[PDB]
Amino acid sequence: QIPASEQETLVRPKPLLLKLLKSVGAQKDTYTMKEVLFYLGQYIMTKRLYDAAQQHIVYCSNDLLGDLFGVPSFSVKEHRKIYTMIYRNLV
Amino acid sequence: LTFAEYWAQLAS
Numbered sequence: 580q581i582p583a584s585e586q587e588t589l590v591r592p593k594p595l596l597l598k599l600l601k602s603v604g605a606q607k608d609t610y611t612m613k614e615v616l617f618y619l620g621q622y623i624m625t626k627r628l629y630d631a632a633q634q635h636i637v638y639c640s641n642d643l644l645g646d647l648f649g650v651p652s653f654s655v656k657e658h659r660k661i662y663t664m665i666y667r668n669l670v
Numbered sequence: 671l672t673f674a675e676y677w678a679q680l681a682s
C-alpha cells in the first residue's frame with residue numbers, strides 16, 4: 580500500500596495536469612493525492628488507454644498523459660511509480 | 671482484473 584498520510588497530502592497540479600483533471604469533471608485548483616488519482620483514473624477509463632487483454636497495462640504513447648508522465652506506458656500495479664509521475668507534474 | 675478493479679486499489 581501507500582501510506583494514508585501521503586494519500587491526503589495537498590498538492591497543486593501543473594497547468595497541463597490540471598487541464599486533464601478538469602476535463603473529466605474536477606473543479607478545484609488544489610487536490611489531495613487521492614483526489615488526483617480518482618480523476619486520473621476516470622480519464623484513463625474514458626479514453627480506454629489500458630490493454631484489453633491485460634488491463635493493468637496502460638499505453639499512453641499517443642496521448643497527452645504520455646507527454647505528462649514522460650513514459651510510453653506503465654503498470655497500474657506500480658503504485659509508487661504512479662505517485663512519482665504525479666509528483667513531477669506539481670507546482 | 672478489469673482496469674477499474676486494478677485502479678480502485680489505489681483508493682485503499
Ligand SMILES: *CCn1nnc2c1-c1cc(N(C)C)ccc1-c1nnn(CC*)c1-c1cc([N+](C)(C)C)ccc1-2
Pocket residue numbers: 616617620621624672673674675677678679680681682
Ligand atoms: C472499476 C472502477 N471502479 N471500481 N470501483 C470504483 C470504481 C470507479 C468507477 C468510476 N467510473 C465508472 C467512472 C470512476 C472512479 C472509480 C474509482 N476510482 N477510484 N476509486 C476508489 C479508489 C473508485 C471508486 C470509489 C468508490 N467510493 C467513492 C464509494 C469510495 C466506489 C467504487 C469505486
